[PDB]
Amino acid sequence: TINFTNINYYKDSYAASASRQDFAQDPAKFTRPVLDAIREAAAPLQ
Amino acid sequence: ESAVSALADTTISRVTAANTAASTHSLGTGRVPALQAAETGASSNSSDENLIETRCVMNRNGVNEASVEHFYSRAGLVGVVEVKDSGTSLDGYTVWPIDVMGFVQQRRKLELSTYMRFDAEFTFVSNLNNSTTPGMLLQYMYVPPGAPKPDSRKSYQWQTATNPSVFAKLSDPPPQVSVPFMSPATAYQWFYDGYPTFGEHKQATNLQYGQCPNNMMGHFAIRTVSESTTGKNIHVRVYMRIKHVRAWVPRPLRSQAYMVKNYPTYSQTITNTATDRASITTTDYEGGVPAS
Amino acid sequence: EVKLVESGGGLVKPGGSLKLSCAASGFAFSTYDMSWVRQTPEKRLEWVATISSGGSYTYYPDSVKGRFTISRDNARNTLYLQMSSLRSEDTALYYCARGGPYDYDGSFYTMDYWGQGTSVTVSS
Amino acid sequence: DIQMTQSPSSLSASLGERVSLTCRASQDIGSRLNWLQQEPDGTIKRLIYATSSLDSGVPKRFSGSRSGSYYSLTISSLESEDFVDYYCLQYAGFPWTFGGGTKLEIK
Amino acid sequence: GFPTELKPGTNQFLTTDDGTSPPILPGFEPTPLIHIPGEFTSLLDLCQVETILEVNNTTGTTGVSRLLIPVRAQNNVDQLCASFQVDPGRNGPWQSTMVGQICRYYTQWSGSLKVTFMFTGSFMATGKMLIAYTPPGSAQPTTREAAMLGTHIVWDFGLQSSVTLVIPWISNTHFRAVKTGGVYDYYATGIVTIWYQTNFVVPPDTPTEANIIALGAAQKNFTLKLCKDTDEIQQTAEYQ
Amino acid sequence: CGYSDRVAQLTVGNSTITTQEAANIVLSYGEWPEYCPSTDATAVDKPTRPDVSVNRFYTLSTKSWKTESTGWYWKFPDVLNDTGVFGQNAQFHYLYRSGFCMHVQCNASKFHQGALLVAAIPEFVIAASSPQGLYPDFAHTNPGKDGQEFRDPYVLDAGIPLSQALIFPHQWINLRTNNCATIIMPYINALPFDSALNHSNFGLVVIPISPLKYCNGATTEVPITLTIAPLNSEFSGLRQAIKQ
Ligand SMILES: CCCCCCCCCCCCCCCCCC(=O)O
């Protein structure tokens, strides 16, 4: 196709469509929020 | 001619899920990729390739619809204002406070986050009691905090010299309008653990616990542009689509049934998050016939 | 061995009071929820009271609620049942047994070790 | 109140037979039905708990099961010290109710 | 002026159309954006967080006693401790988990699961358990010899008090529907049963009964699609 | 190298905390407490930074763990608002900003069993259970040093299920593996500074999931002690001392 989309027709930047071109993932701040990094192969408490 | 390169990238590119690597058997000591310590507070680092012998899968499943943009950018009912002009309410106007926490579907999705910062799109679907849409003219005025609020269908505040107003008919496509982020703070707050004002909060009714004026964004004033009673009641439905979302501090989803807007009050008959079995051993699955 | 010894029976006149202790021995009395049980002369058991392992929680059936009170002394390993205005419908053999709905690790010792059985008699 | 009904108020048998005593519930109680045994002197002991678990120290002749709403206690081979009394106790609702006795006799 | 022709879909309010509406406040510059810790951009990042499974959801069990799998010293051998199904969006233990509530906002799921078990007993209590995942097709295993035939781990209690059972992704299709029951048992995931490999042995003057905490989560290859509404909470009147 | 040592020493200010059976240290949301950068500041007054006087460990409460114990919760700035030079810089100033390092202490014998859930909930709004009567009292919202015993820990007294509280920065005190929980939490708010008297940033929650069981002859009294320490504490807007 030609993809004539995501055009803004107003002077205020918040009138634009949704921001859907950035799918960032970073779960480590909820899944491993610890000070000491624990390798998978190692016994954690030693 | 540098926008032709920008217009080509205006599509949702697929980001695939994680792949699986082939694994073999492991017979040795000191390598325990399955023993964890949940007291640490971290989730298990154990992967599939270390618990069973796995194959090589090149996973092509997309993960885009799980974004907070796609999860939230979807319109939903946030208000129902009824402009009464019949019977014992010959008003012709209503002033409705802007609270998006009056309907369970939008409320439970928003209360997944502690702080949200977003622009919005507000659509108004207005009609009569019998789904009909005559050519009655309506004014949808927005009254920010501090602005004077109307007191009749023919009062000076409807001059909307500075307030944003939308004039439309019931016989037209639903009015739609883009609203920016309008809070003194840097993010909205569905959970405020505190009080708005200083003082000894020793009242019988502690009606002010949790009320943050950073979310109080004013009133919506809706009138029929008339000179007398029209005798017809008009229902207006407000749908809020969230755009440019940023969310912080995830929270548990609501388990109990809501009771009141602006408060997390629940009932003394506490319900269970999970349904009930007959025993800790009973499962509901009658599979095939065993060969033995 | 778990041993519960109830004591305090007697012939109390109608509309009176009576206290029934229960000496516990052989187990950690501060970790188990206790409860009292009745046995109508018609050989029909009935629940009368229950108390948490610390003494904060109590539950009484509607037939008993308001009159009887169930206490707990953990330092002395004793369990009490303070009765109030009585009637002939309360003349029965009372038992002290383990069990209570105020323990997250319960459902195992629910009515596992009963006592010997006191005897109250409300008449004139 | 969850009324629990023991079917036989009395059952005669002879040493070696196989008896069974049922006790139905008025509402769903799950696996929270126990069984007791009152001796002639007046001592109560718990035989089966959770409808399928035998107390530590009870003979293997006792077996509890559930078939729908009916909770049954089966004595496979009756010995001499098994002819006294049996009660069913439910602890799923808050008003914990008991049955009505299943005094077994000899013939 | 410029000739145009309207097409079907005119004047429609599609509640999921990413469009452009007029701005009600020209020249509006909002409050600056400061750094708030804890920003999450994906729901899959929340699905990989372990949350407590409500395995003891039997009738009469109230409160926090529903988050506890009772474990006990056994008189017999090779006995069953607890069972549950590994369908995330089914009425059962997975309703208490974050992956089980995010799943109900979507129609289809894919990827591996993860049920971490934690033994909250005495230091002097030892034991070994066989936790087995039975792929679809078979009912709940009636014996341990039957469950042994599936994906299973043997778990020895000790210093490290937790173990991870990775429910692997064994599926006919690339995705499974969150709905289950009836014809939709075509998308059944399986059954996880916990057996006693050995006994639960304790020295004298030590409690003979303990608990196991189950923590369910999703692995790195988890995905969701076809965003939908949830059957969790209901409403009969506006909250006012 | 890739493990977590069990011995730990936490020294801030003039206080030192030792533990020989620690699990790890939770760094909430991966971020350390920091001062307010000039790019994200709004007030023009110069802030006060009492480094060693304020940022230190305060042992504030000890609760008796029992079999029939529901739990306890404290609100962070409220728990320290009448104590030390923190409870004086927070009464003389209108604006406040600080992180903390929560340390919970519960030790028992190897013949005891039980597990606690120690979590730090941002914006922990306590609800009321209705049959006033619909809003919680001030004793249940800001309970101070002597915290508040939970009424319905299954719902965290907030309508949210306890099973999913692990989405918050958390740790376990499992009496067979560890005897302390440590959570470092940065300042989390939609505003650079805020009042330490009218707003509680975080809620500190300690809930027993597997009750405390022991045998006859063991020590029946097992206490839980809460030690807290502000980190990177700033204060602005000096005025007369106010205690609300
Ligand atoms: C021209 C007329 C247009 C009407 C514009 C009004 C809509 C204003 C948007 C305000 C909503 C922002 C977020 C909602 C915050 C409310 C939360 C709460 O009160 O608990």
* CATH classification of the domain holding B143: 2.60.120.20
The count of domains in chain B is 1
Each domain of chain F, given as residue ranges in start order, spans: 25-36+45-238
As a whole number of angstroms, the distance between CA E178 and CA A25 comes to 23
Q: Which helix H or strand E contains B68, and what residues bound it?
A: helix B68-72
Residue ranges around ligand 1 (CB below 6 Å): B 98-101, 120, 122, 140, 142, 164-166, 177, 179, 182, 188, 215-217, 220; E 24
The identity of residue F125, as a single letter, is V
Q: Provide the number of CB pairs (under 8 Å) joining chain A to chain F.
A: 53
Sequence-ordered strand ranges (E) for F40-169? 58-65, 72-75, 93-105, 113-122, 129-130, 148-149
Looking at the domain assignment, is residue B240 inside a domain? yes
Which residue type occupies A10?
A: Y
Backbone φ and ψ of B6, nearest 5°: -75, -35
CB F3 to CB A44 under 8 A?
Answer: yes
Query: Could you give the domains of chain C?
Result: 3-9+17-102 (2.60.40.10)
Contact B12, A21 (CB under 8 A): yes
Read off the CATH number of the domain in which E198 is found: 2.60.120.20
Closest CA to C110 of E38, E153, D88, B207: D88
CB contact under 8 A, C56 and F68: yes
Mutation test of the interface with chain F: which of C104, C107, C113, choosing the one with the most F Cβ atoms within 10 A? C104
CA distance D106 to B79: 75
Q: Which of F225, F207, F106, F104 is nearest to F158 (CA)?
A: F207
Query: Which residue among A11, A18, A26 sits closest to E26, beta carbon to beta carbon?
Result: A11
CA–CA dist B27, B29 (Å, integer) = 7
CB under 8 Å to D14, separation ≥6 — which residues?
Answer: D78, D106, D107
This structure was determined by cryo-EM
Q: How far apart are CA E233 and CA B103, in angstroms?
A: 11
Smallest CA-to-CA distance from B10 within F171, A28, D28, A19 is with: A19
Which residues of chain E does B113 touch, with a Cβ-Cβ cutoff of 8 Å? 40
Q: Choose from E43, E45, E164, E224 for mutation: most chain A CBs within 10 A.
A: E45
CA distance B215 to B107: 14
Q: Which residues of C66-103 are buried (b: 16+ CB within 10 A; e: fewer)?
A: ebbbbebebeebebbbebeebeeebbbbbbbbbbbbbb
Q: Which pair of structure tokens corresponds to residue C123?
A: 């008449």
Q: State chain C's maximal CA–CA distance in angstroms.
A: 45
Please list the residues that pair with B77 across neighbouring strands.
B239
Q: For residue E66, which phi and psi values (nearest 5 degrees)? A: -90, -10
Q: How many CB atoms lie within 10 A of CB B69?
A: 24
CATH code where residue D15 lies: 2.60.40.10
CA distance F40 to chain E (A): 5
Can you list the positions of beta strands (E) in B13-112?
35-36, 77-83, 85-86, 89-90, 93-97
Q: HEC string of E139-195?
A: CCCCCHHHHCCCEEEEEECCCCCEEEECCCCCCCCCCEECCCCHHHHHHCCCEEEEE
Q: Does any domain span residue B1? A: no
Q: What are phi and psi of F163, to 5 degrees?
A: -60, -30
Range of the domain at B229: 78-194+207-250
Phi, psi of D67 (to 5 degrees): -130, 85
Q: Is B274 a member of any domain?
A: no
**Token duo for residue B196:** 């708005």
The secondary structure of residue E39, as a DSSP letter, is B
Contact B49, E210 (CB under 8 A): no
Answer whether A41 sits within 8 Å of F5, measured CB to CB: no
Distance CA D94, CA B268 (A): 16
Single-letter code of the amino acid located at E237? A
Choose among D101, D63, D89, D71: nearest CA to D3. Answer: D89
Strands F230-238, D33-38: parallel, antiparallel or unpaired by DSSP?
A: unpaired
Q: Are C53 and F209 an interchain contact pair (Cβ–Cβ within 8 Å)?
A: no
Would you say E209 and E71 are in contact if contact means Cβ atoms under 8 Å apart? yes
Considering only CB atoms, A18 lies closest to which of B35, B43, B243, namely B243
Token pair in block for residue F62: 């000890």
User: With contact defined as beta carbons under 8 Å apart, do F108 and F177 qualify?
Assistant: no
Contact B114, B249 (CB under 8 A): yes
F49-88 b/e (C-beta count within 10 Å ≥ 16 → b): ebeeebbbbbebbebebbbbbbbbbbbbbbbbbeeeebbb
Question: CA distances (Å), B101 to each of B113, C83, E94, in order?
Answer: 14, 51, 27
- CA-based angle B125:B126:B130, to the nearest 5? 120
What gap in Å lies between CA E45 and CA E62, rounded to an integer?
A: 31
The alpha-carbon gap from C16 to the nearest alpha carbon of chain D, in Å, equals 26
Residue of E nearest to D93 (CA): E60
Give the alpha-carbon dihedral of F183, F189, F193, F199, to 10 degrees: -90
Cα gap B245→A18, rounded to integer Å: 8
Residue B261 covered by a domain: no
- Partner-chain contact E122 F111, CB within 8 Å: yes
Residue E27, in any domain of the structure: no
Number of neighbours of residue B88 by Cβ within 10 angstroms: 5
- Report if residue B5 sits inside a domain: no
- Whose C-alpha lies nearest to ligand 1, atom 18? B99
Locate C116 and state its tokens: 């010997």
- In total, the C-beta contacts within 8 angstroms joining chain A to chain B are 80
Q: Which residue's CA is minimally distant from atom 19 of ligand 1?
A: B99
- Please name which of B222, B217, B244, B225 lies closest in space to residue B125, comparing C-alpha atoms: B222
* C-alpha to C-alpha distance for F17 and F33, rounded to whole angstroms: 19
Helix-strand-coil split of chain D, %, nearest 5 = 0, 45, 55
Neighbours of chain A (3+ CB pairs under 8 A): B, E, F
CA atoms of B273 and B252, how far apart (whole Å): 12
**CB neighbours of C95 closer than 8 A, spacing ≥ 6?**
C6, C36, C37, C38, C39, C114, C115, C116, C117, D44
Q: Do the domain assignments include residue B219?
A: yes
Residue D29, domain extent? 4-106
Distance of CA B283 to the CA centre of its chain: 35
Question: Does C102 touch chain F if contact means CB atoms closer than 8 Å?
Answer: yes
Strand pairing category for E106-110 and E176-177:
antiparallel
Q: How far apart are CA B118 and CA B245, in angstroms?
A: 5
- Given a contact cutoff of 8 angstroms between Cβ atoms, the answer to whether E20 and A16 are in contact is yes
Label residues F100-126 b or e (16+ Cβ within 10 Å = b).
bbbbbbbbbeebbbbbbbbbbbbbbbb
The tokens of B208 are what?
Answer: 């002010």
Residue that has been written with the tokens 């104590």 in this structure: F83
Nearest residue to E177 via CA among E167, E185, E166, E169: E185
Closest CA to B239 of B87, B117, B81: B81
Centre of ligand 1 to C-alpha E41, Å, is 23
Q: Provide the shortest C-alpha distance from residue C40 to chain D (in Å).
A: 11
How far, CA to CA in Å, does F241 sit from each of B47, F56, F106? 56, 22, 36
Cβ(D62)–Cβ(D48) below 8 Å = yes
What is the structure's resolution, reported in angstroms to one decimal?
2.6
Alpha helices by DSSP H, chain E: 44-47, 98-102, 144-147
Going by alpha carbons, the residue nearest to atom 20 of ligand 1 is B99
* Of F130, F115, F91, nearest in space to F239 by CA: F91
Q: How far is it, in rounded angstroms, from Cα B111 to Cα B253?
A: 7
Give the atom of ligand 1 at the shortest distance from the alpha carbon of B164.
Answer: 1
Rounded Cα gap, residues E21 and B133, in angstroms: 22
- CATH fold of the domain at F25-36+45-238: Jelly Rolls (2.60.120)
Q: How open is the CA angle E72-E73-E78, to the nearest 5 degrees?
A: 95
What is the Å distance from ligand 1's center to B241 Cα? 11
Q: Is E47 helix (H, G, I), strand (E, B) or coil?
A: helix
